[PDB]
Amino acid sequence: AVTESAPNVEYHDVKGDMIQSVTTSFDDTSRLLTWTINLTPRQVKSNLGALVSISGNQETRTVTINGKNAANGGVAWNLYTGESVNNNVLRITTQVNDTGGEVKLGLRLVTSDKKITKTNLPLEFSQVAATTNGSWDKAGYNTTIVEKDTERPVVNVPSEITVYRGESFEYFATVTDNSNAFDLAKTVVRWLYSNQPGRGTEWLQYSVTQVGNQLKVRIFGNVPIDTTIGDYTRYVVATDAAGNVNATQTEMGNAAVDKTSVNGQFKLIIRFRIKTPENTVFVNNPNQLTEVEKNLVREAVKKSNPDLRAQDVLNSNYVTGITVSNNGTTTITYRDGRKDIIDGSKFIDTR
Ligand SMILES: [Ca+2]
């Protein structure tokens, strides 16, 4: 990624008459730094010369003057020469090391109708007339470049997010990073296969905010009353400013196949919200229900839970999935093997 910036002015000779403005553009992929120096000499002349100093954390790659590669005059300072035009640009590109930190650029600039050489460059305004006899400038700039960030961001998400059919939910994840700088657009909640909430869970929504040095990820939505009961693996995948991700596409795929976990993974569990019958079932002996009575009990649980479909229980069969004990305690075993238990005494009276 790129960032375009304007560096600090460390020093500038008030008697300079060339530099119009300086900007910087850093590419954090290549870690190339570009210093752009816009020039409007009062005395254009034919030739432009630039004595360039850079901090030890940079090493020069390219220097262009008026769009063309500058002749390298050679050597703390290095001479570059090229064409002088009234609206000119000197562009200096450096490789920044891995550390980054404060970067500096120093400049001694001239125009001249003479060939500009290392023996004839003036070091101060007062020596200009006797040497290059044109325009002159003298400045130093500084700015700060981030350290190379190779450490992935870390998501903290509940290991399990449980939601209920017919109800809304809201959970929260957090992301941190050593750089404390993130890419919120590339921070998502998704299933394995694509950047989408996933087939069967299209209702899964999220939003991302930066709160201080953390990301706050809201995971929320409304669960349809007829969505599939069971569990799903989903992933919080966050990207830092440098482009590091907590879990890569390859890693997610391996984790899904091997049944292992990645940072940011959670299990999304969809549950039915069970309701105890309010309608009383009357039995002969509350400790030994007859088979006829157990069927009354199953029907009453079905009545009190009308959104519980055959396909929602074990083996898609109400008789298999809703079992009733000798004391009328009812177990509802769902298609996924999870279960709810209703105490029989809650809704069973002795006749
Ligand atoms: Ca990082």
Instruction: Give me the DSSP letters along 87-156.
Output: SEEEEEEEEE-SS-EEEEEEEEEEEESSPP-TTT--SSGGGTTTTT-S-EEEEEEEEEEPPP-----EEE
Ligand 1 center to 290 CA (angstroms): 66
Residues 95 and 154 both lie in one domain: no
Q: How many domains does the chain have?
A: 3
List beta partners, residue 313. Answer: 334
Residues 6 and 140 both lie in one domain: yes
- The residue from 102, 124, 148 where one domain ends is 148
- The residue from 238, 271, 304 where one domain ends is 271
User: Could you tell me if 281 and 250 are in contact, meaning their C-beta atoms sit under 8 angstroms apart?
Assistant: no
User: Could you tell me if 278 and 304 are in contact, meaning their C-beta atoms sit under 8 angstroms apart?
Assistant: yes
Ligand 1 center to 149 CA (angstroms): 5
Ligand 1 center to 99 CA (angstroms): 14
Residue range of the domain that includes 258: 149-271
Kind plus residue range of the DSSP H or E element containing 68: strand 68-69
Structure determination technique employed: X-ray
Residue of 198, 208, 272, 209 lying closest to 233 (CA atoms): 198
Distance (Å) of CA 38 to CA 25, 48, 109, 316 = 14, 13, 12, 75
Ligand 1 center to 250 CA (angstroms): 19
- The residue from 241, 271, 301 where one domain ends is 271
CA distance 240 to 153: 6
Residue 119's CATH number: 2.60.40.3260
The tokens for 84 are 């002088």
List beta partners, residue 81. Answer: 49, 71
CA distance 182 to 179: 8
SS3 323: strand
